Structure formats: structure tokens, C-alpha cells
Symmetry: D2
Subunit: 300 residues, 4 copies
């Protein structure tokens, strides 16, 4: 079709890697994280960076805080990587870029990964970490509001934790910033089948990541299963034109607005899955990320 030519390389890198559903998952995570750290740019400079230990019930997560503006308010960032890879180090240039462009604190959280830890572990990490930080604000130097954000699998966690906050009548995030979340048990929508091969994220990789994270349709795994979208936090949704996960995301925006939740959704023309973390590689993608980061503070 008309995918942005900036992606030509990645769409090659993808094809010539061949099939990977057959190599050990721990082996696979390692390779992918190493790739991501490779041809990367100068990290934008951030005034203060601080490392944290989020001591939860029965597990401790690493969190890195990025702050360029002695910011009052924060976003908790949950990285993508299909619930299998990504970590603070591979997301470091991107979270820096987010912090610089938003001028708010960005707290990048390492939830537990599949297949060692299956659902609901990473979900419970996101929900518990939000509430940990929401109670321990001062430790993180947060004087204002806290929202949540993520990309891909991490944006699934961000959306899901907000549903749980709403369901339990708990403290709510101020905003949910969702860069192309997985949301639904989808092997059949039109975006899924049309873009199910060759656009970096494949139909086969979706099923494989799905098999690794799940044991054996709950709303905290798949938010589009929820019965009610009212009283969720204001949302920013970013979708990609050529991405199997596109259609369910655009439905989610529409459901939020129907429920009277404040929500802006934009589809990036010519973009693919992973666009946001491709900000150093695609100027269109970089401008989409800059657009979102620059309005984030208005919600905090």
C-alpha cells in the first residue's frame, strides 16, 4: 500500500530475520533488546534522572524517572514489547524524548515479563505501581497530578489499569496516553487481516505474544470487553494507518466518547506498529510523538 518510505529498512530488517516463533523466549528477548540499543541517537539531555525501587507485594520493580523542568506533575510510562521484551535501558532515549518534549516527569516502570510471568502479573504491576506512586508522591517529588501512558503492550496496561481504578472507585489517573495498545481478542478485523503480514508486527507474532502472556476475554487483559466506559480518565489515542491493531483502537476512542469521556484520537497516515519508538528513524513518527508530548502537560 502506501506505507511511509522511512519504514522501508525496518520492513526489510523484519523480513530477513525470518521466523522467530521457534527460538527460546529468553533468547529472543535478548536479541531484540540488543537490536533496539544499537543504531540509536544521542539521548536528549535531561536535567535530573533518578532511579527507584518500587517495592510491591512480593516483588520489586525498577523505575527510572526522567525530569527536565523540575516538573510538578508526572506520567507513569509503561513500555511496549509484546509483554515479552523492552526494559528501562531500551526505552531510555524515548523516555528522555518524552520528558524533554512534554516538560513533565516521566517515570518509566519495568513490569514483569512473559513467559516467566503470565497475566495478571504485568497488569497487577501496572495497577499496583500507579497506586504505589500515587500514595508515595513526595518520594518522587510530584507536587501535582499523575497520569499513565504506554505504547503497544504497555498502552494495554495503561488502559486496563484505568478500568480497574474506575471499577474499584479508586484514585484515578489524570490522563491515559495510549500509543497503539493491544485491546481486544482480535484475529478477524479488517486491519488485522489486511496488515497481518509484512508490516513489522505480524498476525503470527500477535498470536505468539498472546500465547506467552496468557494462561487460558477478561476486561483487564482486553479492555474492549468492558461493559461500561463511563468515568474513565481523559484519553489521547494514537493509531497507525498500517497496523493490524488499528481498528480495535479506533473503536475504543469512539466508545470513550460515547460514554462521555474526554478523548482525542489521531491515526498517523502511512505509519506502522512501533512508530513512536521509531521517532529517531521516521520524521513523521517523530512529529506525531512531539504533538502528543506537547499537549500532555495541559492534562496535569
Amino acid at each position: 500500500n502506501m506505507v511511509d518510505p522511512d519504514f522501508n529498512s525496518l520492513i526489510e530488517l523484519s523480513k530477513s530475520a525470518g521466523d522467530m516463533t521457534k527460538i527460546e523466549p529468553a533468547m529472543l528477548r535478548n536479541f531484540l533488546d540488543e537490536s533496539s540499543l544499537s543504531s540509536r541517537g544521542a539521548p536528549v539531555e535531561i536535567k535530573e534522572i533518578k532511579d527507584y525501587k518500587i517495592k510491591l507485594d512480593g516483588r520489586t520493580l525498577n523505575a527510572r524517572m526522567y525530569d527536565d523542568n523540575n516538573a510538578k506533575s508526572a506520567i507513569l510510562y509503561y513500555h511496549g514489547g509484546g509483554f515479552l521484551f523492552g526494559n528501562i535501558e531500551t526505552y531510555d532515549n524515548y523516555c528522555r524524548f518524552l520528558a524533554k518534549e512534554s516538560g513533565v516527569k516521566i517515570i518509566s516502570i519495568e513490569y514483569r515479563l512473559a513467559p516467566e510471568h503470565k497475566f495478571p502479573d504485568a497488569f497487577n504491576d501496572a495497577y499496583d505501581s500507579f497506586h504505589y506512586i500515587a500514595k508515595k508522591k513526595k518520594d518522587f517529588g510530584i507536587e501535582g497530578r499523575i497520569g499513565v501512558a504506554g505504547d503497544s503492550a504497555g498502552a494495554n496496561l495503561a488502559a486496563a489499569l484505568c478500568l480497574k481504578c474506575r471499577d474499584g472507585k479508586t484514585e484515578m489517573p489524570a490522563v491515559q496516553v495510549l500509543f497503539y495498545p493491544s485491546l481486544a481478542p482480535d484475529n478477524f478485523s479488517r486491519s488485522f487481516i489486511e496488515y497481518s503480514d509484512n508490516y513489522v508486527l505480524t498476525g503470527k507474532m500477535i498470536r505468539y505474544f498472546g500465547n506467552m502472556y496468557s494462561k487460558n476475554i477478561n476486561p483487564y487483559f482486553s479492555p474492549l470487553v468492558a461493559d461500561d466506559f463511563s468515568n474513565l480518565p481523559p484519553a489521547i489515542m494514537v493509531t497507525n494507518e498500517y497496523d493490524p491493531l488499528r481498528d480495535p483502537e479506533e473503536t475504543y476512542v469512539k466508545k470513550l466518547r460515547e460514554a462521555g469521556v474526554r478523548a482525542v484520537g489521531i491515526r498517523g497516515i502511512g505509519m506502522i506498529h512501533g512508530s513512536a519508538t521509531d521517532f529517531e528513524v521516521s520524521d513523521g513518527a517523530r512529529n506525531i510523538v512531539k504533538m502528543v508530548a506537547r499537549i500532555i502537560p495541559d492534562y496535569l
Copy 2:
């Protein structure tokens, strides 16, 4: 929105009937059946009509056979109605039209209806009746081949029974003719969100029908949950442009072809859910039904 103007009365009738999820199951069935009985045109004349009792393990189904052409072969037809409504009487004019246009025997089978009978009752009715007639083909005067067909819920039964025949390595139908089946657990595709209000079948009614059929994602309820599409019978798939159920159906026919199963799919431009049984009100619809019925005999 460019829906065929022949549907305008039906769409209005449907909006002015109010919120149907509101009314109790058996009451709604009766009202929907009586609504279709009124819309009825003059029945097409058929040379031989015969009534049968299909005597299955623990229940007996009515079946009616229409034969305008002393035909060697037959199609078993499972009526639509969301698993809640429809019967031989409401389908009689349409089944006569199919028999006249195809020149083959059409056997319309009354399966058991939800909510009184939930999954897998209708499903087992479809699969058992296929095998009953296949085993007893001389009782129906069938000397050639037997295929299966349906519309909406009935085409779900047709596609699902073919999956079970394949899985069990049993006798297979010769062809599966699917008019707009339900196939997937879908509350999120683009067709579902875009067309879930003003097009006769609503998103709300889809959810009501689904909760009535189900107990409590397995392939005989939702064929799109299947692992494997190889070795299924040749298929004819008809979708409608303005129908929330459309995108999964188009995916289904692409997954059949991907597996090497012979399949032809057509989307009816400007058509809505129910178009085939609306053959007396829309000439567009009538010609789509005629197109399909006239190629059936080539598979038999």
C-alpha cells in the same frame, strides 16, 4: 451512508419498533416472526414439497424439502434469526425461491432456538442433521451430493458443522453456502462500530442474541477461533456492505483461500444484514440470491 433505497422502509420500521432488547425472549420471537410473515409476497410454485421428521438422539426436528426439478442432489438449509427466531414457515417463500433458482433439492431444517436451548443445541442439530440425511439419503430421493447453507445464524451453523466434519474426518458436505454468517466474538471491528445502529441489525441486538445463545470462544460457536482452515468444503460467501457482521466474514473467506480451500466471496454493494431474505423487497438482493443459487448446482 449510501444504503440501497429499497431498504428505507425496513430501516424505518426497525427504528420505530423501539428498543427490542427491552422485550422478553419468546415475545420478541413471536413479534419478529409475525413481522416477516406480513412482508410476504406470492410464493413461487414448486413441483414437489414434502415434510419430514428428523429423528435425532433426544429430539426430533421438522424439515421441509422443496424440489422443482426431480433433483439428484440437495442443499440442507439452516435458517437465520439470531438463534432466537425464524422457522420453516417464515423461511418458506425464500426456500421456494432457492429451489426454483438452483434446480436442486432444498431441505429447510428447524433447529432448536435460544434461550430455551443454548449452545451447543442448535449446533448439534445442524451437524447431526447433516449426517442423518447423508446416512439416509435414499429416503429423501437423493442420489448425488449434499451441501450445506444458511444465512446469518444459520450460516454460522453451516460453517461450524463443516469444521466438526473436518476435525472428525467424517463425510463432508460438498459445498458450504454462507449468507452473512455470524462468526466471531465481535464488538470492535470497524464494520461493527460503523454500522451498529441504523441498518436493521443493531450492535445492541447482536449482544442480546449472543447472550441468549451462549451459556458461557470455541470454534463450533465461533468458527474464526479455529486453528486451521485446511480441507474444508468449497465455500460461497456473501457479505453485505452496510452490516456490522461484514468484516469478520470477509476475513473468513481470505482465511479459507489462505488454507487452499476453494472459495468465492462477494460483497453486495449497498446491501444490509438480512438482504437475502429481503429478496421480495430489494431487486439488488434478489439478483445476488439468484447469482448464488444458479451456481450451487455446479458443486453437486
Copy 3:
């Protein structure tokens, strides 16, 4: 995307020929017509085939009449080829198949080709040949009705000649059977941009053909520029899912139904431009052509 895998060979062969837009038209015509004759399959047997000279004012056209059924009625068929190529011989296997499946006379007419003969020559050939045969019907053994049909550029001629019959209040054809016509001045619709390079009918070639046919708003060149679709003949419209020409065609069907003209439109799922004349290599395409051909006699 999910193009039916039956077309993978044609897509590859189209890629292998490279960019033919700097080829001189007469050389390209030779290449494409001779390529087609060299690689075609076994022809279907037809009871009677007869060649005619259509003696119009100022020029004589070749016509071949195919009749498997001593039929009373006829379709005048105008072949495709971008206005530049194709002829009776390259269409002969396909015209035979239409005759066998429809049971009516098919008269394949050789209109004048561009750039040697620019618009309005082919159009005048199409309109004048319809009126010539309609006046002289008894000479061709036609006792019943006459419709018109074509594919691609030939379906443009069929749709355009109907518009001029309507405008002039002359005898109108009984039906217009349009397989994926060119209809509009389009280098910008979504089907055009999404599907215009995957090799078979490209954007660059669509331009090359239009520039060869135009001398430099005329509804008889582009029917979508007509301001009125009333009182046109009943239409059958076939479009292909993965074809740059698709979206204007699907708009044309809708415009016809908005003006109250009988029309049925079907989009072939997984099909590409040229699908009908590909009937020997794709069973899905073959079944779409059979569907259409078998309802043609109802209009005559």
C-alpha cells in the same frame, strides 16, 4: 494484503515486464496481445460462431457472434484493454465462456483503438454499433432483446453509450453489464492510491492509457461526470477488492440506485483488475463471471 493466491503468478509476471510507460503504443499492443494468445488455455466448445462486418458510417468494425443455444436475445460485448489493446482473438476464450454460461448470443465488437483513434472514436463505435445491430436485428437472427456489456475500458464504453441513448431519447439497451469499468478522472481515491502499484494495473499505466485515449467534462468519456442518472438501463456492476478502479465504480452503482435505476453491484473479495478475463486461472473469478452470466438471460 489478502489478494487471492491464484493471482500470485500474474502479479509476478506483471512485475517482470517492468515499466512499460515509455513503450510506443503499437509495440505495446503487439506485446500484450501476442503475449495473451501465446499463453491462453483450451477454448470452450460453442455450437455456432460467426464473423460479421459492422458497416458503420465511415468505418467498418469486425464482430464475432457466439451462440451456444440458438438464442433469441443478445449481448453486445466490448472488450477491455485500456482503449489501446485487446481484440476479438485475445478475447475469444472469454467470450466463448460467456456464451456457454449465459445461453444467449454474445457479439464481441472490435472498436477502434487509441492513440491512432482517440476519443470519441471507440465511444462512437460502441454507440453506433449498438444502434446498427438493434436496427438490423433480424440480420443477426436476434428476435428478442439486446443488452450491452464490457470489461475495463469496454465497460466504460457500455456505460457511456447508455448515457447517450438516454440523452438522445433513443432506443436504449435492455441491460448494461459492467465488469470493473474505468469511469472517472481518478488519481486520488483511496482504492487508487492503495492499489496502484502492486504491478498489474498501476497508477502510471492508468495515466498512460488515459493520455493515449484523450485528445487533450465529457460524460461520454467519464460517465461519473453526468449530472443525471435517471432512466438508464438496469445495471449489473462487478468491482474487485484490490483494484485502483474500484471506488469510483462502487460510487456509480450507488448513483444509479439514487436515480431509481435497477442495479446490482458486487465486489469480488480478493480479486484484482482483469479478474473476469482471468477466469481460467482463478476459480473465484470464474465463479463471479458464471454468477453474472447466469442472470443475464433474465434481462433479455
Copy 4:
């Protein structure tokens, strides 16, 4: 699934019915007064200055907004179908663009149809860009100049860039295109699917097209252009439920095929006019803020 914020505007537009028989000066009057009547509170801006741009054979009004003592500028061509709109009815919106972008916004009043048919507005846009590019110091401009517009004004912005490139003249720094009309379209899928019920109708499109044309030229319709290379970096914003959407998404794909820097976003649930509806739709407001906040990076 149109954003519920537009429910009212869609209803009001349905109510009005087909206004083809209203004299074009009266339709202009009514639509302009309707815009003024529904203004919210204006955003305060540090400096606003009025100018006359004396061109060959006509003078244009222009209004400069500057909230940030800025060095660079965007020339803004309002929308209105080539028939209506003016500096006053665009004043709340150009104030918001100037507040959110922190660069100078200079809103230019080009000549309107049908009194002034193509190529008058087009010449006004191209000539006023070159006038101010040649005379930058007279406007307090020390840096760069880009061009922008919505709907018909975004057509003028796109078309003037094509002429700059064709004449190898000075080029704007960036072209910021809010849902321009670009092509002779009465047949795309967005055109036919969103031709009624979405405020801008297929009948209005033909009507404005007929008022502008003296009755396939690329400075009328940029999608007719031969070649898209060497055009200014672009930001393209389209609306999901708008008959003009598909050609616009084609244009962004063509710019990128030509190696022009471009970023294109489709606003989910949005309709034609979404940017100038920033006072009534928060999603629309957030789209305009997204775009305005990136503008300074090109200047």
C-alpha cells in the same frame, strides 16, 4: 461514530436544507454573521496589528497576531469555500493559533468568489507570500515564513507552494494544511459516504466549486500536479467523517513518495471544519493545539 460534540452542528445544518437559491453575497453574509454570533471569549494576545498589502491591481487586508515577540511567521489563508470567511470571523481562531504556536500569525484576506473567480484568490495567496517574503522587515520578521490554511485556504496554501517550486522561486519554510480541497472529486469513497449529514455536503462542494471556477488546472487542483518533489515540509490534518478526506490522505502519500518531509494525521470522529470548531469540541481543540505546538520547529 461522529464525535458527539458535533451533534448540534449537524442538526442545524440538516435544518437549513439546500441553500443554492440564496444569492451568494447573502449566503456569505449569513455564514459570516453566524460565525460571529457563536464566538467564545477571545484569547488575549500581546500584539495585534492591521496591514494593507498593496498588490498589482488590488489591496488586501492582513492582520498579524503575535503573542511572543516572535521572529518567524505563518501566513494564514482562511477557509470558507472560496466564498465566505474573513479576518473578523477568523479572529478567535487565529488568536488561538498565535497563543499556542508562539509565532507570528498573519491572516490574509484574499478576494472571494463568485465576484472574483479563479485565479484571483490563488494569485492573492502566491503574491502575498512573495510580497511579505520580499518585505520581511516591514512585518517585524527576522526569521522564516511558512504558509497555512483550512479547507479552501489550505488549497491556496498547497497550490502556492506548487507555483513557488515550478518557478524555482523562494519557498515557504512549511505548509500547514487543515483539510484542503485538492481534487475534482465527486466519486471517492469518502466523498460518497460522507456526502450528506456531516455539515459539509456533496451539493455544497459542487456549489462552491461552481462559484470559484470560471467553468483540471494544478493551481486550482494541486492533485493534478505532475510532480511533488521539492515542496516545503508539510503537516496534513484530515477528518475521519468528511467527504474531502480521501484526496487529502492521497496527497500526504504522494508528498512522501516524492521525498518531501510530511506528517499526516486523521482526526478520529472529526468532521469538516473541526479546526475552526475548537471552541465546541475538545478533541478538535487538542488537534489544533498538537499542530500549533509543532509549528515553531519548522521556523
